[PDB]
A paper describes a structure:
Its main function is to serve as a molecular chaperone helping nascent polypeptides avoid mis-folding and limiting protein aggregation during thermal stress. Although the compounds represent diverse chemical scaffolds with unique properties, they all inhibit the enzymatic ATPase function of the chaperone by binding the ATP pocket in the N-terminal domain (NTD), which together with the middle and C-terminal domains define the highly conserved Hsp90 protein architecture. T. brucei Hsp83 (TbHsp83), the subject of interest herein, is 59% identical in sequence to human Hsp90α.
The benzamide derived compound 4 was identified through a chemogenomics approach coupled to lead optimization to produce a highly selective and orally active Hsp90 inhibitor for cancer treatment. As seen in the compound 3 complex, the benzamide ring occupies the purine pocket in the same way as the natural nucleotide and establishes similar polar contacts as the other two T. brucei Hsp83 inhibitors. The modified dihydroindazolone group occupies the pocket 2 but unlike the previous compounds a hydrogen bond was observed with Tyr124. The new position of Asn91 side chain was stabilized by a polar interaction with the indole nitrogen of Trp147. The tilted position of helix-4 moving towards the binding pocket also affected the secondary structure at helix-4 C-terminus changing from compact turns observed in the other two complexes to extended β-bridges. Overall these structural rearrangements create a closed pocket that occludes most of the inhibitor from the solvent.
Author numbering: 0 to 162, 165 to 209
The structure:
C-alpha cells in the first residue's frame, strides 16, 4: 500500500535528534509537559466559552486523563480541550513549533536545560524522551477528527480518522527501557506532584 508523508522542517528535526540521541536522566518530565499542553488547550476552549457557551456543546467537563495500556504498552494523555484542525496537524502548528524550537535550542546552548522545554511551548516533543512513536488524535469544533503520527526520522503523517467529541488524545508507544511509565505508583506520584499546579482535574486510569 501507499502512505502520504509530510516532512518536518529543519528546526523540529534538530530538536528531535537532540531529544532522541542524547542521554537525559530526568526523562519523567514528559508527563508534566503533555499535561501542561492539555491544560492550555482546556484554557483556550474555556476562554471561547466565556462569550459563546455553545463552543462546549455536548462536552462541558474540561478534564485531563492519563491512561496506561499494559497490553499494547502505551501511555495515553487525553483532554477535552480546544482540539486541533487538519491544518494545525499538517503544519505542526507552523510558526509556533519553529519559534519555540529555535529559542529552546538557543536556551540549551546558553545554559538552559531540557526540563525548561515547556517554557518555549515545544514541550510536546519531550514525548520522544520515552516514546519511539507518538500518535496524536485530535478533534476541533471547526473540523473533523484527524490523526497525526510520527516515529521521528524527519517525517509525520496526517490521516482522516472519525471519531472523542472535542479535544486531543496523545498515544505514546513507550520505548523498551521506559515501561516504568505503565506502573500505577509511578504515574500516581508524578501526577500528584504536578496536579497542584493544574486548574483541571487529572484522572488516572487505575487497574481493576
Ligand atoms: C501539532 C502537533 C502534532 C505537533 C507539534 O509540533 C505540536 C506543538 C508545538 F511543538 F508546535 F508547539 N504543540 N503541540 C501540541 C500538543 C498537544 C496539545 C494538546 N493536548 O492540546 C496542543 N494543543 C494546542 C492546539 C492548538 C493551539 O491553538 C492551542 C494548544 C498542541 C503539538 C502537536
Amino acid at each position: 500500500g501507499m502512505t502520504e508523508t509530510f516532512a518536518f522542517q529543519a528546526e523540529i528535526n534538530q530538536l528531535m535528534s537532540l531529544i532522541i540521541n542524547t542521554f537525559y536522566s530526568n526523562k519523567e518530565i514528559f508527563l508534566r509537559e503533555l499535561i501542561s499542553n492539555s491544560s492550555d488547550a482546556c484554557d483556550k476552549i474555556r476562554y471561547q466559552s466565556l462569550t459563546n457557551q455553545s463552543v462546549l456543546g455536548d462536552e462541558p467537563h474540561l478534564r485531563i486523563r492519563v491512561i496506561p495500556d499494559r497490553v499494547n504498552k502505551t501511555l495515553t494523555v487525553e483532554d477535552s480541550g480546544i482540539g486541533m484542525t487538519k491544518a494545525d496537524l499538517v503544519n505542526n502548528l507552523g510558526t509556533i513549533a519553529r519559534s519555540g524550537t529555535k529559542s529552546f535550542m538557543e536556551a540549551l546552548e546558553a545554559g538552559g536545560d531540557m526540563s525548561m522545554i515547556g517554557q518555549f511551548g515545544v514541550g510536546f516533543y519531550s514525548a520522544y524522551l520515552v516514546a519511539d512513536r507518538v500518535t496524536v488524535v485530535s478533534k476541533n469544533n471547526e473540523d473533523d477528527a484527524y490523526t497525526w503520527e510520527s516515529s521521528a526520522g524527519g517525517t509525520f503523517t496526517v490521516t482522516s480518522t472519525p471519531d472523542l467529541k472535542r479535544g486531543t488524545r496523545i498515544v505514546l508507544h513507550l520505548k523498551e527501557d521506559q515501561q516504568e511509565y505503565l506502573e500505577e505508583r509511578r504515574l500516581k506520584d508524578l501526577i500528584k506532584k504536578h496536579s497542584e499546579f493544574i486548574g483541571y482535574d487529572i484522572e488516572l486510569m487505575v487497574e481493576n
